[PDB]
Amino acid sequence: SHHHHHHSHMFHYHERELESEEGFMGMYDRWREQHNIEMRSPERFNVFKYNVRRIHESNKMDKPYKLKVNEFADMTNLEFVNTYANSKISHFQALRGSAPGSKDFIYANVTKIPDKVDWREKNAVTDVKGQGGCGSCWAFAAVVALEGINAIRTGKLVKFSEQQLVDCDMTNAGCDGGLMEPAFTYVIKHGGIAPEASYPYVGKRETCDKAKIKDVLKIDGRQNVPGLDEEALRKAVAHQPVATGIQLSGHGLQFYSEGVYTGDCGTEPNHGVGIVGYGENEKGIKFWTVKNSWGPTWGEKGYIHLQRGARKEGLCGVAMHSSFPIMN
Protein backbone atom coordinates (compact mmCIF):
# COMPACT_ATOMS: atom_id res chain seq x y z
CA SER A 1 0.00 0.00 0.00
CA HIS A 2 1.29 3.49 -1.10
CA HIS A 3 0.97 5.00 2.45
CA HIS A 4 3.09 2.19 4.15
CA HIS A 5 6.53 3.64 4.97
CA HIS A 6 8.00 1.46 7.77
CA HIS A 7 8.50 -1.65 5.58
CA SER A 8 9.50 -0.98 1.87
CA HIS A 9 8.58 -20.97 1.57
CA MET A 10 5.69 -18.41 1.40
CA PHE A 11 1.96 -19.37 1.23
CA HIS A 12 0.07 -17.29 -1.29
CA TYR A 13 -3.63 -16.49 -1.00
CA HIS A 14 -6.11 -13.91 -2.32
CA GLU A 15 -8.07 -11.65 0.05
CA ARG A 16 -11.34 -12.85 -1.63
CA GLU A 17 -10.78 -16.37 -0.12
CA LEU A 18 -11.43 -14.86 3.40
CA GLU A 19 -14.87 -13.53 2.31
CA SER A 20 -16.74 -16.90 2.37
CA GLU A 21 -16.64 -20.33 4.09
CA GLU A 22 -16.13 -22.01 0.65
CA GLY A 23 -13.14 -19.75 -0.20
CA PHE A 24 -11.73 -20.25 3.31
CA MET A 25 -12.17 -24.09 3.07
CA GLY A 26 -10.41 -24.06 -0.33
CA MET A 27 -7.53 -22.00 1.16
CA TYR A 28 -7.35 -24.41 4.17
CA ASP A 29 -7.12 -27.53 1.85
CA ARG A 30 -4.45 -25.77 -0.30
CA TRP A 31 -2.54 -24.77 2.89
CA ARG A 32 -2.68 -28.40 4.17
CA GLU A 33 -1.40 -29.80 0.86
CA GLN A 34 1.49 -27.26 0.54
CA HIS A 35 2.63 -27.97 4.13
CA ASN A 36 2.13 -31.82 3.89
CA ILE A 37 -0.52 -31.78 6.65
CA GLU A 38 -3.15 -34.49 6.35
CA MET A 39 -4.94 -33.79 9.68
CA ARG A 40 -8.19 -31.73 9.32
CA SER A 41 -11.25 -31.14 11.55
CA PRO A 42 -13.83 -28.36 12.18
CA GLU A 43 -11.77 -27.26 15.28
CA ARG A 44 -8.48 -27.10 13.30
CA PHE A 45 -10.23 -25.22 10.49
CA ASN A 46 -11.58 -22.80 13.17
CA VAL A 47 -7.98 -22.24 14.50
CA PHE A 48 -6.75 -21.79 10.91
CA LYS A 49 -9.41 -19.03 10.20
CA TYR A 50 -8.61 -17.29 13.53
CA ASN A 51 -4.83 -17.26 12.78
CA VAL A 52 -5.22 -16.29 9.07
CA ARG A 53 -7.50 -13.36 10.00
CA ARG A 54 -4.85 -12.14 12.51
CA ILE A 55 -2.01 -12.65 9.96
CA HIS A 56 -4.03 -10.77 7.30
CA GLU A 57 -4.87 -7.87 9.69
CA SER A 58 -1.26 -7.65 10.93
CA ASN A 59 0.04 -7.41 7.31
CA LYS A 60 -2.30 -4.43 6.66
CA MET A 61 -0.53 -2.47 9.47
CA ASP A 62 2.54 -0.27 8.83
CA LYS A 63 5.49 -2.05 10.49
CA PRO A 64 8.93 -3.30 9.39
CA TYR A 65 8.09 -7.05 9.44
CA LYS A 66 5.69 -9.46 7.76
CA LEU A 67 3.89 -12.59 8.94
CA LYS A 68 3.17 -15.68 6.89
CA VAL A 69 0.60 -18.50 6.99
CA ASN A 70 3.28 -21.10 7.84
CA GLU A 71 2.87 -24.79 8.88
CA PHE A 72 1.89 -23.70 12.44
CA ALA A 73 -1.32 -21.95 11.17
CA ASP A 74 -3.63 -24.71 12.60
CA MET A 75 -2.06 -24.39 16.13
CA THR A 76 -3.35 -21.95 18.76
CA ASN A 77 -0.55 -19.75 20.14
CA LEU A 78 -0.95 -21.51 23.52
CA GLU A 79 -0.37 -24.97 21.88
CA PHE A 80 2.49 -23.48 19.79
CA VAL A 81 4.31 -21.93 22.81
CA ASN A 82 3.79 -25.08 25.00
CA THR A 83 5.25 -27.27 22.25
CA TYR A 84 8.11 -25.13 20.81
CA ALA A 85 9.06 -22.37 23.32
CA ASN A 86 9.05 -24.28 26.61
CA SER A 87 12.72 -24.34 27.80
CA LYS A 88 11.89 -22.33 31.01
CA ILE A 89 15.00 -20.03 30.92
CA SER A 90 13.46 -17.17 33.06
CA HIS A 91 11.96 -19.78 35.47
CA PHE A 92 15.36 -21.56 36.03
CA GLN A 93 17.22 -18.25 36.12
CA ALA A 94 14.94 -17.12 39.03
CA LEU A 95 15.37 -20.51 40.84
CA ARG A 96 19.15 -20.83 40.19
CA GLY A 97 20.73 -17.59 38.95
CA SER A 98 20.82 -13.82 39.52
CA ALA A 99 18.45 -10.99 38.52
CA PRO A 100 19.36 -9.43 35.12
CA GLY A 101 22.09 -6.80 35.38
CA SER A 102 23.31 -8.55 38.63
CA LYS A 103 36.15 -11.55 37.27
CA ASP A 104 35.20 -8.57 35.02
CA PHE A 105 33.64 -8.66 31.52
CA ILE A 106 36.50 -9.44 29.05
CA TYR A 107 35.10 -6.93 26.47
CA ALA A 108 34.41 -4.09 28.99
CA ASN A 109 37.33 -1.89 27.75
CA VAL A 110 36.76 -2.34 24.00
CA THR A 111 36.02 1.08 22.42
CA LYS A 112 36.20 0.42 18.67
CA ILE A 113 33.64 -2.13 17.35
CA PRO A 114 32.14 -2.44 13.81
CA ASP A 115 28.75 -0.86 12.97
CA LYS A 116 27.62 -4.15 11.36
CA VAL A 117 28.57 -7.76 12.14
CA ASP A 118 27.29 -10.96 10.51
CA TRP A 119 28.96 -14.17 11.72
CA ARG A 120 27.13 -16.20 8.98
CA GLU A 121 29.25 -14.36 6.37
CA LYS A 122 32.44 -15.33 8.28
CA ASN A 123 32.01 -19.16 8.26
CA ALA A 124 31.24 -19.17 12.01
CA VAL A 125 27.58 -20.29 11.83
CA THR A 126 26.31 -23.80 10.92
CA ASP A 127 22.99 -24.47 9.13
CA VAL A 128 19.69 -23.93 11.04
CA LYS A 129 18.67 -26.99 13.16
CA GLY A 130 15.31 -28.33 14.40
CA GLN A 131 14.92 -28.84 18.13
CA GLY A 132 11.42 -30.41 18.13
CA GLY A 133 9.16 -30.48 21.26
CA CYS A 134 12.15 -30.96 23.62
CA GLY A 135 12.82 -27.99 25.93
CA SER A 136 16.51 -28.04 24.92
CA CYS A 137 16.85 -24.49 23.52
CA TRP A 138 19.48 -23.86 26.25
CA ALA A 139 21.64 -26.61 24.61
CA PHE A 140 21.02 -25.25 21.05
CA ALA A 141 21.91 -21.67 22.22
CA ALA A 142 25.12 -22.91 24.00
CA VAL A 143 26.07 -24.90 20.83
CA VAL A 144 25.70 -21.80 18.54
CA ALA A 145 28.24 -19.99 20.74
CA LEU A 146 30.57 -23.09 20.88
CA GLU A 147 30.43 -23.67 17.07
CA GLY A 148 31.14 -19.94 16.69
CA ILE A 149 34.28 -19.77 18.92
CA ASN A 150 35.70 -22.99 17.44
CA ALA A 151 35.26 -21.76 13.83
CA ILE A 152 36.66 -18.25 14.58
CA ARG A 153 39.87 -19.73 15.98
CA THR A 154 40.49 -22.79 13.81
CA GLY A 155 38.89 -21.71 10.53
CA LYS A 156 36.96 -25.01 10.37
CA LEU A 157 33.21 -24.89 10.91
CA VAL A 158 32.13 -28.02 12.90
CA LYS A 159 28.56 -28.80 14.12
CA PHE A 160 28.65 -29.71 17.84
CA SER A 161 26.33 -31.94 19.95
CA GLU A 162 23.22 -30.55 21.65
CA GLN A 163 22.36 -34.18 22.56
CA GLN A 164 25.53 -34.61 24.65
CA LEU A 165 24.43 -31.57 26.73
CA VAL A 166 20.84 -32.91 27.04
CA ASP A 167 22.00 -36.42 28.11
CA CYS A 168 25.17 -35.64 30.13
CA ASP A 169 24.80 -32.20 31.76
CA MET A 170 23.22 -33.25 35.12
CA THR A 171 23.15 -29.59 36.36
CA ASN A 172 20.49 -28.91 33.68
CA ALA A 173 17.05 -30.52 33.29
CA GLY A 174 17.33 -32.20 29.83
CA CYS A 175 14.13 -31.84 27.77
CA ASP A 176 12.50 -30.09 30.74
CA GLY A 177 14.68 -26.98 30.28
CA GLY A 178 17.90 -25.43 31.54
CA LEU A 179 20.45 -22.60 31.27
CA MET A 180 23.38 -21.80 28.95
CA GLU A 181 25.89 -20.66 31.62
CA PRO A 182 25.96 -24.14 33.42
CA ALA A 183 25.99 -25.88 29.97
CA PHE A 184 29.32 -24.04 29.31
CA THR A 185 30.49 -25.10 32.84
CA TYR A 186 29.69 -28.73 31.97
CA VAL A 187 31.89 -28.47 28.78
CA ILE A 188 34.80 -26.99 30.86
CA LYS A 189 34.60 -29.41 33.81
CA HIS A 190 33.69 -32.65 31.99
CA GLY A 191 36.21 -32.91 29.15
CA GLY A 192 34.71 -31.10 26.16
CA ILE A 193 31.89 -31.32 23.62
CA ALA A 194 31.71 -33.91 20.82
CA PRO A 195 30.76 -33.10 17.19
CA GLU A 196 27.10 -33.71 16.15
CA ALA A 197 28.48 -36.41 13.71
CA SER A 198 29.70 -38.42 16.75
CA TYR A 199 26.75 -37.70 19.19
CA PRO A 200 23.63 -37.05 17.01
CA TYR A 201 20.45 -35.27 18.09
CA VAL A 202 17.44 -37.48 18.97
CA GLY A 203 15.10 -34.89 20.52
CA LYS A 204 14.60 -36.76 23.80
CA ARG A 205 16.91 -37.34 26.78
CA GLU A 206 18.69 -40.70 26.68
CA THR A 207 21.45 -42.37 28.66
CA CYS A 208 24.73 -40.41 28.60
CA ASP A 209 26.85 -42.47 26.14
CA LYS A 210 30.60 -41.96 26.82
CA ALA A 211 31.50 -43.92 23.63
CA LYS A 212 29.96 -41.10 21.48
CA ILE A 213 32.11 -38.44 23.27
CA LYS A 214 35.21 -38.11 21.02
CA ASP A 215 37.08 -35.48 18.82
CA VAL A 216 35.98 -32.96 21.46
CA LEU A 217 36.12 -29.16 21.47
CA LYS A 218 37.62 -28.05 24.80
CA ILE A 219 37.02 -24.53 26.27
CA ASP A 220 38.75 -22.60 29.13
CA GLY A 221 36.06 -20.42 30.65
CA ARG A 222 32.75 -18.64 30.22
CA GLN A 223 31.08 -15.42 31.29
CA ASN A 224 27.82 -13.61 31.32
CA VAL A 225 27.43 -10.41 29.40
CA PRO A 226 26.53 -7.59 31.98
CA GLY A 227 22.73 -7.67 31.79
CA LEU A 228 20.24 -4.94 30.75
CA ASP A 229 22.93 -3.36 28.54
CA GLU A 230 22.51 -3.76 24.77
CA GLU A 231 25.81 -1.86 24.23
CA ALA A 232 27.76 -4.44 26.36
CA LEU A 233 25.94 -7.19 24.35
CA ARG A 234 27.00 -5.44 21.07
CA LYS A 235 30.64 -5.47 22.30
CA ALA A 236 30.50 -9.27 22.92
CA VAL A 237 28.65 -10.05 19.58
CA ALA A 238 31.37 -8.03 17.74
CA HIS A 239 33.87 -10.70 18.94
CA GLN A 240 31.82 -13.89 18.72
CA PRO A 241 28.24 -15.34 18.64
CA VAL A 242 26.53 -15.04 22.05
CA ALA A 243 23.98 -17.39 23.69
CA THR A 244 20.92 -15.63 25.14
CA GLY A 245 17.39 -16.21 26.32
CA ILE A 246 14.39 -14.74 24.45
CA GLN A 247 10.64 -14.82 24.87
CA LEU A 248 8.91 -16.14 21.73
CA SER A 249 5.19 -15.90 22.63
CA GLY A 250 2.42 -14.24 20.61
CA HIS A 251 1.11 -14.73 17.08
CA GLY A 252 3.66 -12.22 15.73
CA LEU A 253 6.39 -14.72 16.64
CA GLN A 254 4.62 -17.93 15.65
CA PHE A 255 4.15 -16.41 12.13
CA TYR A 256 7.21 -14.19 11.76
CA SER A 257 8.37 -14.29 8.16
CA GLU A 258 10.83 -11.40 7.41
CA GLY A 259 11.96 -7.88 8.28
CA VAL A 260 12.91 -6.44 11.67
CA TYR A 261 10.60 -7.71 14.40
CA THR A 262 9.33 -4.71 16.40
CA GLY A 263 6.06 -6.23 17.70
CA ASP A 264 4.80 -7.24 21.13
CA CYS A 265 7.15 -9.27 23.19
CA GLY A 266 7.53 -10.02 26.90
CA THR A 267 10.54 -10.05 29.23
CA GLU A 268 10.22 -13.66 30.50
CA PRO A 269 12.56 -15.72 28.24
CA ASN A 270 11.28 -19.24 27.47
CA HIS A 271 13.59 -20.03 24.51
CA GLY A 272 17.41 -20.04 24.13
CA VAL A 273 18.84 -18.58 20.88
CA GLY A 274 22.21 -17.59 19.42
CA ILE A 275 22.94 -13.95 18.51
CA VAL A 276 25.06 -14.10 15.35
CA GLY A 277 25.09 -10.46 14.33
CA TYR A 278 23.72 -6.94 14.40
CA GLY A 279 23.18 -4.07 11.99
CA GLU A 280 20.77 -1.38 10.85
CA ASN A 281 18.37 -1.70 7.89
CA GLU A 282 17.94 0.88 5.03
CA LYS A 283 15.22 2.73 7.01
CA GLY A 284 17.50 3.23 10.06
CA ILE A 285 16.00 0.37 12.14
CA LYS A 286 18.72 -1.20 14.32
CA PHE A 287 18.58 -4.99 14.77
CA TRP A 288 20.11 -8.17 16.27
CA THR A 289 20.41 -11.22 13.98
CA VAL A 290 19.18 -14.23 15.93
CA LYS A 291 19.59 -17.92 14.95
CA ASN A 292 16.53 -19.94 16.00
CA SER A 293 16.17 -23.79 16.27
CA TRP A 294 12.72 -24.14 14.60
CA GLY A 295 14.13 -25.31 11.29
CA PRO A 296 14.49 -23.40 8.00
CA THR A 297 10.74 -22.93 7.24
CA TRP A 298 10.30 -20.38 10.09
CA GLY A 299 11.38 -16.70 9.73
CA GLU A 300 14.11 -15.77 7.23
CA LYS A 301 15.41 -19.32 6.52
CA GLY A 302 15.35 -19.96 10.30
CA TYR A 303 16.53 -16.50 11.46
CA ILE A 304 14.84 -13.55 13.09
CA HIS A 305 16.03 -9.91 12.95
CA LEU A 306 14.95 -8.46 16.36
CA GLN A 307 14.83 -4.69 17.02
CA ARG A 308 17.98 -3.54 18.85
CA GLY A 309 17.78 -0.59 21.30
CA ALA A 310 14.03 -1.18 21.98
CA ARG A 311 14.19 -1.29 25.80
CA LYS A 312 16.63 -1.71 28.70
CA GLU A 313 15.99 -5.55 28.77
CA GLY A 314 16.23 -5.66 24.98
CA LEU A 315 13.17 -6.60 22.89
CA CYS A 316 11.88 -10.12 23.91
CA GLY A 317 14.29 -9.92 26.91
CA VAL A 318 17.28 -10.50 24.52
CA ALA A 319 19.64 -8.49 26.79
CA MET A 320 18.71 -10.10 30.14
CA HIS A 321 20.74 -13.35 30.38
CA SER A 322 23.48 -13.63 27.78
CA SER A 323 26.62 -15.69 27.99
CA PHE A 324 29.55 -16.90 25.93
CA PRO A 325 32.40 -19.43 26.06
CA ILE A 326 36.07 -18.40 26.39
CA MET A 327 39.15 -20.15 24.90
CA ASN A 328 42.10 -18.36 26.56
Side-chain angles (χ1 to χ4, degrees), residues 283-299:
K283 293 190 172 172
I285 305 161
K286 293 173 184 170
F287 60 84
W288 293 110
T289 300
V290 171
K291 188 182 184 194
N292 202 356
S293 51
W294 293 346
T297 74
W298 181 90

Side-chain angles (χ1 to χ4, degrees), residues 152-163:
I152 292 164
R153 296 168 62 83
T154 69
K156 298 219 260 203
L157 182 58
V158 177
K159 273 181 164 179
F160 288 101
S161 183
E162 292 88 2
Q163 196 65 45

Side-chain angles (χ1 to χ4, degrees), residues 202-240:
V202 302
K204 196 176 181 285
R205 186 167 67 92
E206 292 190 322
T207 301
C208 168
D209 186 352
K210 291 157 189 169
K212 298 187 187 88
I213 309 165
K214 65 200 183 198
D215 309 316
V216 298
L217 160 66
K218 285 184 166 79
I219 64 163
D220 303 307
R222 46 94 194 89
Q223 40 178 234
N224 301 314
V225 166
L228 311 181
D229 190 340
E230 285 188 285
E231 190 56 30
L233 183 51
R234 199 170 65 97
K235 293 183 188 175
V237 177
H239 293 80
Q240 64 194 105

Side-chain angles (χ1 to χ4, degrees), residues 47-244:
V47 176
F48 178 84
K49 291 191 278 179
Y50 194 97
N51 286 330
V52 166
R53 287 209 249 264
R54 297 201 74 185
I55 289 155
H56 192 68
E57 288 314 303
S58 162
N59 289 345
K60 287 203 277 182
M61 306 200 78
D62 198 356
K63 63 197 159 69
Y65 62 95
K66 294 147 159 177
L67 304 188
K68 78 176 172 267
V69 188
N70 62 27
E71 61 259 61
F72 311 113
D74 66 350
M75 294 184 87
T76 70
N77 191 247
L78 182 67
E79 290 164 337
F80 179 81
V81 168
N82 288 346
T83 307
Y84 299 112
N86 202 353
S87 293
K88 311 180 179 63
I89 289 173
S90 50
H91 169 81
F92 287 126
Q93 189 68 38
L95 292 158
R96 310 162 62 195
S98 297
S102 306
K103 29 144 251 298
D104 295 308
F105 179 46
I106 67 161
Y107 303 123
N109 308 318
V110 183
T111 46
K112 203 189 275 177
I113 65 161
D115 283 345
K116 291 173 184 190
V117 162
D118 193 343
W119 289 108
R120 303 171 298 175
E121 296 180 357
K122 299 199 264 169
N123 192 242
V125 186
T126 64
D127 297 339
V128 167
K129 299 162 185 192
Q131 156 183 340
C134 179
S136 58
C137 87
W138 55 276
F140 283 81
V143 168
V144 175
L146 293 156
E147 289 172 343
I149 196 166
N150 180 67
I152 292 164
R153 296 168 62 83
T154 69
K156 298 219 260 203
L157 182 58
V158 177
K159 273 181 164 179
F160 288 101
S161 183
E162 292 88 2
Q163 196 65 45
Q164 181 185 333
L165 298 179
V166 167
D167 296 350
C168 316
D169 181 9
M170 302 305 176
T171 66
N172 271 315
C175 283
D176 234 76
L179 299 169
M180 293 82 71
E181 193 275 349
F184 296 135
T185 300
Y186 161 79
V187 175
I188 296 157
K189 291 188 172 183
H190 307 83
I193 189 167
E196 169 105 294
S198 182
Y199 209 140
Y201 191 68
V202 302
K204 196 176 181 285
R205 186 167 67 92
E206 292 190 322
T207 301
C208 168
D209 186 352
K210 291 157 189 169
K212 298 187 187 88
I213 309 165
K214 65 200 183 198
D215 309 316
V216 298
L217 160 66
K218 285 184 166 79
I219 64 163
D220 303 307
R222 46 94 194 89
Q223 40 178 234
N224 301 314
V225 166
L228 311 181
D229 190 340
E230 285 188 285
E231 190 56 30
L233 183 51
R234 199 170 65 97
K235 293 183 188 175
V237 177
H239 293 80
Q240 64 194 105
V242 169
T244 196

Side-chain angles (χ1 to χ4, degrees), residues 28 32-33 35-41 74:
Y28 179 49
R32 279 197 297 114
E33 175 188 325
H35 296 92
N36 296 277
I37 295 163
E38 184 188 274
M39 183 63 194
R40 67 162 168 148
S41 68
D74 66 350

